[PDB]
Design an enzyme around this catalytic site. Structure first.
Site, short mmCIF file in Angstrom:
data_model
loop_
_atom_site.label_atom_id
_atom_site.label_comp_id
_atom_site.label_asym_id
_atom_site.label_seq_id
_atom_site.Cartn_x
_atom_site.Cartn_y
_atom_site.Cartn_z
N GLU A 1 0.89 -1.19 -0.04
CA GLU A 1 0.07 0.07 -0.16
C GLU A 1 0.87 1.33 -0.08
O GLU A 1 0.48 2.29 -0.50
CB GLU A 1 -0.96 0.05 1.25
N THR B 1 -6.18 7.38 -5.18
CA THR B 1 -6.14 7.53 -3.95
C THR B 1 -5.25 8.93 -3.54
O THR B 1 -5.77 9.72 -2.89
CB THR B 1 -5.63 6.32 -3.15
N1 LIG Z 1 -1.82 -5.89 -8.30
C1 LIG Z 1 -2.11 -4.88 -8.24
N2 LIG Z 1 -3.60 -4.87 -8.36
C2 LIG Z 1 -4.09 -3.43 -8.29
N3 LIG Z 1 -3.31 -2.37 -8.37
C3 LIG Z 1 -2.16 -2.40 -8.49
C4 LIG Z 1 -1.37 -3.81 -8.37
N4 LIG Z 1 -0.11 -3.72 -8.68
C5 LIG Z 1 0.14 -2.25 -8.56
N5 LIG Z 1 -1.08 -1.54 -8.67
C6 LIG Z 1 -1.09 0.00 -8.68
O1 LIG Z 1 -1.76 0.70 -7.61
C7 LIG Z 1 -2.44 1.53 -7.79
C8 LIG Z 1 -4.18 1.44 -7.20
O2 LIG Z 1 -4.19 0.48 -6.10
P1 LIG Z 1 -5.72 0.40 -5.65
O3 LIG Z 1 -5.98 -0.69 -4.77
O4 LIG Z 1 -6.86 -0.02 -7.00
O5 LIG Z 1 -5.80 1.69 -5.11
P2 LIG Z 1 -6.73 2.89 -4.87
O6 LIG Z 1 -6.66 3.68 -6.52
O7 LIG Z 1 -5.82 3.70 -4.06
N6 LIG Z 1 -8.07 2.77 -4.24
P3 LIG Z 1 -8.69 1.98 -3.07
O8 LIG Z 1 -9.52 0.91 -3.56
O9 LIG Z 1 -9.48 2.97 -2.08
O10 LIG Z 1 -7.66 1.49 -2.30
C9 LIG Z 1 -2.48 1.78 -9.41
O11 LIG Z 1 -1.47 2.55 -9.69
C10 LIG Z 1 -2.01 0.45 -9.84
O12 LIG Z 1 -1.37 0.35 -10.97
N1 LIG Z 2 -8.40 5.74 3.88
C1 LIG Z 2 -7.82 5.89 2.50
C2 LIG Z 2 -8.54 4.26 1.90
C3 LIG Z 2 -8.42 4.17 0.69
O1 LIG Z 2 -8.90 2.83 0.02
C4 LIG Z 2 -8.75 7.02 2.04
O2 LIG Z 2 -9.89 7.24 1.98
O3 LIG Z 2 -7.95 7.96 1.42
#
Ligand SMILES: Nc1ncnc2c1ncn2[C@@H]1O[C@H](COP(=O)(O)OP(=O)(O)NP(=O)(O)O)[C@@H](O)[C@H]1O
Ligand SMILES: N[C@@H](CCO)C(=O)O
Ligand SMILES: Nc1ncnc2c1ncn2[C@@H]1O[C@H](COP(=O)(O)OP(=O)(O)NP(=O)(O)O)[C@@H](O)[C@H]1O
Ligand SMILES: N[C@@H](CCO)C(=O)O
EC number: 2.7.1.39
Lengths: 296, 296
Positions: free
Chosen positions: B126, B179
């Site tokens: 993360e 995010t």
């Molecule tokens: N195995 C993977 N699965 C999903 N995303 C990945 C992975 N490896 C790298 N990433 C990258 O990480 C980012 C997104 O991770 P993701 O969990 O979808 O987060 P998010 O955009 O923060 N939303 P949330 O679901 O609230 O955590 C993108 O830049 C992706 O390309």
């Molecule tokens: N607590 C984080 C969670 C992302 O899944 C946010 O809302 O920025």
């Protein structure tokens, strides 16, 4: 005719539970007697000469008047108060009088109000004495145990009984701290990070009570970096005391807006922790979680 | 040889539990297989062409490398990922890969790590994908149920199983929300009043789970005025949807940083609420609270 009650002191905030958490103490407490009288006036007698007898200024009179008017009660009341502790001690002294009065009026005039409503009425007393209708001391004074004021307008109070032993030590400095001032010196804003810390730690304290984990409860209680470090500088020797009892308590923090200090000593060090507190503050008492206003 | 797991999507924040609360979903989930290989390299295959296969960029590779190095494991791994949902959906897609990988590596190499440690390792994934070692999605992905991240450095996670029925509807918009950006647009500071509101409401949600009160849980969940009103403006029709399902759900809010929407429908209106969500977002799914990563 008459109703007499013991209305307990309470410790609000408990660190990260600022303006939300409250813990009812068994002692000290106010002894309050309310007698219905024919004249439609409110007469107040109080043993502490620094507390007003004017019914529009003593919180007991403010609460009684509000209840009497709200229910079209056609009587006055004579209210006699024997104080458990002085005002401005951080032990919910005025909340004890507000809550004890709400409870007593409810009994005296058979209003059959539920606890939440009694807290709501008592909070009118807190409005006057602190300039804010906060219910975090009157809630535990009425419910006993641990309470959380989770909403205002309308007031919502969640109660968690403490059905396990929780020894409490309270050190009561002779100085007083005015709650309104104690609040003005607080930050007007907090960083997102403190929001996250306090929310997580306060939720952890709730989890700790349900899991009867004093260690977790006390440790999280001491994690506030927003309010406690500020008010703590108003209390002589407070930080020195925290360090001196460091591994002998589950936690120690400021009771309410101070200057009283509330500690939860480990069973093994209770006498020693009490002696340490007493070396700094002669007025130190050993108590436990109370059950709220009751007839005496 | 090999370990294959289903690693679930999770919904973080839940309104007032921003950066603390997490709820594990049963679906969607990633299906991840990890095979020990002799070459000391990490090879990644993923079915979504928008997710990197570079092991230093895919969170599965980041987590596997950290664990392999920390335990002096002398093997490489081939990791095959079939995505449950796209990244940037607010459903913990990357956390599913991070947590599933931590869990799989732990099993594959018999590291006997406890759940907290698996969350800690997954959070390294993360760190990379969000620029922050937040554990609020990887915690529920590992523990299942409802989790609260109550401290970092060191990480502390409190878990509350959900042993009652809690129907969940998730609407997944086709757009994505990054995010890091979703966090930059947040206020840098919040008023004391929001601190108090969110602490009280989040604690009320914990009380609600212990009392199995969906109504209280859902209503308090919708009381955040700090983060949800901000991120909500990034999601087409989000506020209109909230109003349209108003009395048919215990609560509805943004899942994680969005744009996915998580609703807890009342049993009486589940089909209707699902049809409403689907009218706005074809990709709507009905699920329930999950139990965390498990072998499949
Ligand atoms: N195995 C993977 N699965 C999903 N995303 C990945 C992975 N490896 C790298 N990433 C990258 O990480 C980012 C997104 O991770 P993701 O969990 O979808 O987060 P998010 O955009 O923060 N939303 P949330 O679901 O609230 O955590 C993108 O830049 C992706 O390309
Ligand atoms: N607590 C984080 C969670 C992302 O899944 C946010 O809302 O920025
Ligand atoms: N019956 C009463 N008992 C105590 N204080 C009263 C009473 N009636 C009026 N007051 C006044 O209200 C103020 C203090 O109330 P008190 O509960 O001691 O609050 P505090 O100073 O805010 N500290 P805390 O214990 O944290 O609530 C003083 O101005 C008092 O004179
Ligand atoms: N929450 C209040 C309590 C006063 O007893 C404060 O600390 O200002």
């Amino acid at each position: 005719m008459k109703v007499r009650v013991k209305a307990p002191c309470t410790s609000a905030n408990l660190g990260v539970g600022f303006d939300v958490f409250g813990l009812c103490l068994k002692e000290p407490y106010d002894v309050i007697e309310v007698e219905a009288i024919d004249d439609k006036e409110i007469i107040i007698e109080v043993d502490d000469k620094n507390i007003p007898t004017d019914p529009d200024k003593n919180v007991a009179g403010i609460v009684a008047k509000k209840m009497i008017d709200d229910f079209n009660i056609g009587k006055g009341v004579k209210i006699t108060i024997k104080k458990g502790v002085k005002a401005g001690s951080g032990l919910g002294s005025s909340a004890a009088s507000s809550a004890g009065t709400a409870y007593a009026i409810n009994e005296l005039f058979k209003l059959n109000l539920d606890k939440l409503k009694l807290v709501d009425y008592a909070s009118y007393g807190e409005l006057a004495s602190s300039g804010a209708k906060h219910a975090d001391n009157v809630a535990p004074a009425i419910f006993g145990g641990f309470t959380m004021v989770t909403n205002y307008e309308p007031l919502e109070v969640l109660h968690i009984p403490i059905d396990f032993k929780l020894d409490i030590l309270i050190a009561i400095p002779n100085i007083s701290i005015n709650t309104k001032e104690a609040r003005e010196i607080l930050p007007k804003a907090v960083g997102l990070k403190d929001l996250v810390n306090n929310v997580g730690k306060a939720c952890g304290m709730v989890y700790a009570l349900y899991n009867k984990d004093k260690s977790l409860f006390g440790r999280y209680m001491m994690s506030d970096k927003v309010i406690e470090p500020v008010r703590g500088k108003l209390i002589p020797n407070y930080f020195k005391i925290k360090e001196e009892v460091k591994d002998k308590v589950y936690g120690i923090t400021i009771s309410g807006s101070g200057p009283s200090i509330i500690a939860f000593p480990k069973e093994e060090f209770i006498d020693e922790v009490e002696n340490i507190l007493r070396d700094y503050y002669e007025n130190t008492i050993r108590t436990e979680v109370g059950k709220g206003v009751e007839v005496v």
